[PDB]
Amino acid sequence: QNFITSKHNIDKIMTNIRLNEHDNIFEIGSGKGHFTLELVQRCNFVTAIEIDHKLCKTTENKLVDHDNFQVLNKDILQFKFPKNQSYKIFGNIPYNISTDIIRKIVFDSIADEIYLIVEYGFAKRLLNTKRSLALFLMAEVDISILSMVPREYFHPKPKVNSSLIRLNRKKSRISHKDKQKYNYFVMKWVNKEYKKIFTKNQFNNSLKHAGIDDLNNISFEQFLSLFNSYKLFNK
RNA sequence: GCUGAAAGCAUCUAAGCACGAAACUUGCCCCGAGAUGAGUUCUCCCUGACCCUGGUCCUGAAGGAACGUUGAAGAC
């Protein structure tokens, strides 16, 4: 359900989709072929993965005019990628896949540019720094909200407005060496037990060293500085 | 970081020294010997008889406790 059919809506959505000709594009949903039909002409190669056999066949006979694609169904939960291929990966809209496809795109792949259509709640929640999954997400990639998708766009019109989000990778840090410490850092931070990670000298002087005014509103860069101070204090 | 071989160079170290993190312990203030590992110092008081060899008598110290007038001490 919830498919976008109007070609005007498809064009207006693709207005924010920045895919180039020399990119292979992988997937997470073909739908009724409204978007993959334009996708096969925009980019070089398309990997159409669909969990519905009908939908696979309707994409096939909708795309018989093109040979620059291939279709392959490996439950997204188990599918895998060309660790040695540069690929903008475009995908679709899932149920919730709780850091399930998120891990597939930030932890189980080297995807350089990712586009999602999500529910406005997940657009605003997962952005906030009060959730740990956000912290492991911001560990090496960045998010930008390109646009908000109206709810009537889809065909069993949903109840909640959607939004378009963009993922790009900016890593180089706890790589593999202080990762187990970064994980040790995050869960103790989000669960708010300070004594396990700081005494009181450190807990107070780190905030002023990081320029912290209120603990109820935190940005990312000063959290990074706080983690650097933690590493300095704990060798 | 200085010197220096091990190991004809070299090097903060193997011999030594000098530093050094809004980090640690002290340096500031308070509780604290039920710390059963129960600590230390100063001062004061008790120097009878009998039978028996467990029974009586005489003696009541230093201090504490209780009552009253009460507190800028306090729910009791």
Curated annotation (Swiss-Prot):
Mutating residue 125 to A has which effect? Decreases affinity for S-adenosyl-L-methionine 7-fold. Decreases affinity for RNA about 4-fold. Reduces activity by over 99%. May severely impair protein folding
Entry-linked PROSITE patterns: RRNA_A_DIMETH, SAM_RNA_A_N6_MT
Q: Which NCBIfam families match?
A: Erm23S_rRNA_broad (NF000499), erm_C_23S_MT (NF012219)
What changing residue 157 to A does, per the record, is: Decreases affinity for RNA about 6-fold
Keyword vocabulary terms for this entry: Antibiotic resistance, Methyltransferase, Plasmid, RNA-binding, S-adenosyl-L-methionine, Transferase
EC number per UniProt: 2.1.1.184
Q: What reactions does this protein catalyze?
A: adenosine(2085) in 23S rRNA + 2 S-adenosyl-L-methionine = N(6)-dimethyladenosine(2085) in 23S rRNA + 2 S-adenosyl-L-homocysteine + 2 H(+)
Result after altering residue 131 to A: Decreases affinity for S-adenosyl-L-methionine 7-fold. Reduces activity by about 85%
Q: Which domain of life is it from?
A: Bacteria
Alphabetized GO MF terms: 23S rRNA (adenine(2085)-N(6))-dimethyltransferase activity; RNA binding; rRNA (adenine-N6,N6-)-dimethyltransferase activity
The reported effect of residue 2 to A is: Reduces activity about 3-fold
Please state what class of enzyme this protein is: transferase
What the record says about family reads: Belongs to the class I-like SAM-binding methyltransferase superfamily. rRNA adenine N(6)-methyltransferase family.
Protein name (Swiss-Prot/TrEMBL):
rRNA adenine N-6-methyltransferase
Effect the entry attributes to changing residue 103 to D: Decreases affinity for S-adenosyl-L-methionine 5-fold. Decreases affinity for RNA 6-fold. Reduces activity by 99%
Q: What is the lineage of its organism?
A: Bacteria, Bacillati, Bacillota, Bacilli, Bacillales
Query: What gene name does this entry carry?
Result: ermC'
Give GO BP annotations, semicolon-separated. Answer: response to antibiotic
Protein function: This protein produces a dimethylation of the adenine residue at position 2085 in 23S rRNA, resulting in reduced affinity between ribosomes and macrolide-lincosamide-streptogramin B antibiotics.
Q: Name one Pfam family in it.
A: RrnaAD
Organism, by scientific name, is: Bacillus subtilis
Q: Where is S-adenosyl-L-methionine bound in this sequence? A: 2, 4, 29, 50, 75, 92
Outcome of swapping residue 99 to A = Decreases affinity for S-adenosyl-L-methionine 8-fold. Reduces activity by 99%
One Gene Ontology cellular component term attached to this UniProt record is:
cytosol
